[PDB]
Amino acid sequence: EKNVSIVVAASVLSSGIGINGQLPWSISEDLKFFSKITNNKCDSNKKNALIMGRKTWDSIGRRPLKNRIIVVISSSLPQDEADPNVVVFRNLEDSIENLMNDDSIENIFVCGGESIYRDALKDNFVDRIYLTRVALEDIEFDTYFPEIPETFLPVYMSQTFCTKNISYDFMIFEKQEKQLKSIDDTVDLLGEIFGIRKMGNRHKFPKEEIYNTPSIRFGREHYEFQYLDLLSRVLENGAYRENRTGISTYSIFGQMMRFDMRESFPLLTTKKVFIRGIFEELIWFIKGDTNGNHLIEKKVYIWSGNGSKEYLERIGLGHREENDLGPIYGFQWRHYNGEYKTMHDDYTGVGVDQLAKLIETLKNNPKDRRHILTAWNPSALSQMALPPCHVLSQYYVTNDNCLSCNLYQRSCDLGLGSPFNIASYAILTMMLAQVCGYEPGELAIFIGDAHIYENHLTQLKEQLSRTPRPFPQLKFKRKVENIEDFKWEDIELIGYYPYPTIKMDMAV
């Protein structure tokens, strides 16, 4: 037997791979990959064979590839005994005698051409596939990688990467057909004896019917699986509970998520997110605004519910204006400990400006361990339309001049609250970094009460039924002098190709 792997790079949505004999994009790390993969081998005294269509041979330059043997499939091309590091065959099946001898060849890579992929697949010759998904999708194509036959299952998806503002993943479908017992069993037994008494059982591993792309067992790199998995994790152990809202949830306590911000922008793809809204709110915070209306005007309604005459009236703040939200986030960011009257007053100069002292210590003293911004002020709470969920964040300058962020969130609405929460604090960290001359670090969100509203069940289950695409890229069209200066227009969202929106009602 001998191994056969396809190696290709297609657009994320339509699988385009070619245009007028050329690749539709130029990503050097990808070829660097293609090289490393096609070339990796055990027997130093052996070489890998890369089968490829002629039309490709032409694009390749009709010149050999170092250390390897090119194998062209053509009907006209002459079997040239001239170069020993290339050879022609009249058809794909015949070419696949590399196994049947030529014991010098260790592995075999089907190396592309729409025609040459489709056939290597139809005739069932390939075992693995090394698929590079390129985020970028709105530009003419004439060649296309086929539809990965159902006999193939994703077993790896690398983290999203970026080159020239083009995002891309490296995932490797394998075709399957067909640590020790000791430990797994000892634990299973100890699991029966002791019951809920063994913490292990309090945290059970999600069932496959609620696991997103369950075929990807050991290589869930893509940091979207940090949320899709927390999702499925409460869906498994979430304990049913009532709460103030009137809509019971399923909740565990003490979770964590992570995100890379260097090569991508953790805007979920398994569902189309309201990015603009996410923004107009985050800026609303930075400005230190608390007038719910200033968002209704830019057509953002995330803060109507917890805002209204009726709700207000109901929680003890009916003395409040239709939409005066009291000293919520922002007022606490820009005016800590300020004596709040109404959303109409001029609060300038009152209260501690955390945000400001933050930027200031950020750039003046980087390795300081007190880059904290908080929103939990006991003295205030009762006046707020709702207490702080993202309660306190802490910011951290790496040695390589990168800004990392840590957020604690007491109550996380995995359905509606989180997607926004992950994005927002990404963006705020970038703005923060751009203003202090540093670049995106990482993102860690620590949740206390991670829950799912019972009326978000059929939805989150669909979302979990979608395989993650590459995270897009977020860019600022200009550098600003003051952090409170950004505008929606100053933002470039590049390469966002999410699944359609999933409608979910809010639990007021």
Ligand X SMILES: NC(=O)C1=CN([C@@H]2O[C@H](COP(=O)(O)OP(=O)(O)OC[C@H]3O[C@@H](n4cnc5c(N)ncnc54)[C@H](OP(=O)(O)O)[C@@H]3O)[C@@H](O)[C@H]2O)C=CC1
Ligand Y SMILES: Nc1nc(=O)c2c([nH]1)NCC(CNc1ccc(C(=O)N[C@@H](CCC(=O)O)C(=O)O)cc1)=N2
Ligand Z SMILES: C#CCN(Cc1ccc2[nH]c(N)nc(=O)c2c1)c1ccc(C(=O)N[C@@H](CCC(=O)O)C(=O)O)cc1
- Tokens coding 424: 């927002």
Per-residue DSSP letter, 484: G
Kindly tell me which residue out of 33, 65, 113, 447 binds ligand X, with binding defined by CB under 6 A. Answer: 113
405 is annotated as an active-site residue? no
- The C-alpha atoms of residue 8 and residue 5 are separated, in whole angstroms, by 10
Kindly tell me which residue out of 55, 198, 272, 461 binds ligand X, with binding defined by CB under 6 A. Answer: 55
Decide: is 389 part of the binding site for ligand UMP (CB under 6 A).
Answer: yes
Contact 85, 64 (CB under 8 A): yes
Residue number of the CB atom closest to ligand X: 113
- The C-alpha atoms of residue 421 and residue 408 are separated, in whole angstroms, by 11
In the window 350-379, what residues touch ligand UMP (CB under 6 A)? 369-370
Comparing CA positions, the residue from 456, 462, 442 lying closest to residue 394 is: 442
| Piece in contact with ligand X (CB under 6 A), picked from 16-24, 79-87, 257-265, 328-336 | 16-24
User: One-letter amino acid identity for 103?
Assistant: D
- The C-alpha atoms of residue 155 and residue 258 are separated, in whole angstroms, by 21
- The C-alpha atoms of residue 284 and residue 277 are separated, in whole angstroms, by 10
Decide: is 452 part of the binding site for ligand UMP (CB under 6 A).
Answer: no
User: One-letter amino acid identity for 79?
Assistant: Q
Contact 156, 123 (CB under 8 A): no
In the window 141-160, what residues touch ligand X (CB under 6 A)? 143
| Piece in contact with ligand X (CB under 6 A), picked from 89-97, 262-270, 325-333, 463-471 | 89-97
For ligand UMP, the closer CB: 126 or 427: 427
For ligand Z, the closer CB: 220 or 271: 271
Contact 458, 503 (CB under 8 A): no
- The C-alpha atoms of residue 323 and residue 315 are separated, in whole angstroms, by 13
- The C-alpha atoms of residue 264 and residue 135 are separated, in whole angstroms, by 11
Quick one: what does residue 60 bind among ligand UMP, ligand X, ligand Y, none, with the CB cut-off 5 to 8 Å set by partner type? ligand Y
- Tokens coding 225: 């699986």
| Piece in contact with ligand X (CB under 6 A), picked from 84-92, 146-154, 436-444, 494-502 | 84-92
Where along the sequence are the contacts to ligand Y (CB under 6 A)? Answer: 7-9, 23, 30-32, 34-35, 56, 59-60, 65, 111-112, 130, 132
C-alpha pair distances (Å), 82 with each of 47, 71, 86, 125, 310: 19, 14, 9, 29, 86
Nearest approach, Cβ of residue 118 and ligand X (Å) = 8
**Is residue 79 exposed (0-12), middle (13-18) or buried (19+ Cβ within 10 Å)?**
exposed
Quick one: what does residue 121 bind among a second copy, ligand Z, ligand X, none, with the CB cut-off 5 to 8 Å set by partner type? none
Q: How far apart are the first and last CA of the chain?
A: 62
Residues that bind ligand X (rule: CB under 6 A) add up to a total of: 28
User: Catalytic one among 111, 162, 389, 412?
Assistant: 389
For ligand UMP, the closer CB: 228 or 386: 386
Q: Which residues contact 21 (CB under 8 A, 6 or more apart)?
A: 55, 58, 59
For ligand UMP, the closer CB: 411 or 434: 411
For ligand Z, the closer CB: 141 or 311: 311
Quick one: what does residue 370 bind among ligand UMP, ligand Z, ligand X, none, with the CB cut-off 5 to 8 Å set by partner type? ligand UMP
In the window 194-233, what residues touch a second copy (CB under 8 A)? 194, 196-200, 202, 217-219, 221, 223
For ligand X, the closer CB: 56 or 332: 56
SS3 annotation, 163-182: ECCEEEEEEEEEECCCCCHH
C-alpha pair distances (Å), 504 with each of 301, 348, 414: 14, 38, 11
For ligand X, the closer CB: 144 or 274: 144
* Cβ count near 14 (within 10 Å): 12
Nearest approach, Cβ of residue 59 and ligand Y (Å) = 6
In the window 25-54, what residues touch ligand X (CB under 6 A)? 52-54
| Residues in contact with ligand X by the rule CB under 6 A | 8-10, 17-18, 21-23, 52-56, 59, 73-76, 90-92, 112-116, 119, 143
| Residues in contact with ligand UMP by the rule CB under 6 A | 243-245, 369-370, 386-387, 389-390, 411-413, 417, 421, 507
**Could you give the residue numbers annotated as active site?**
389
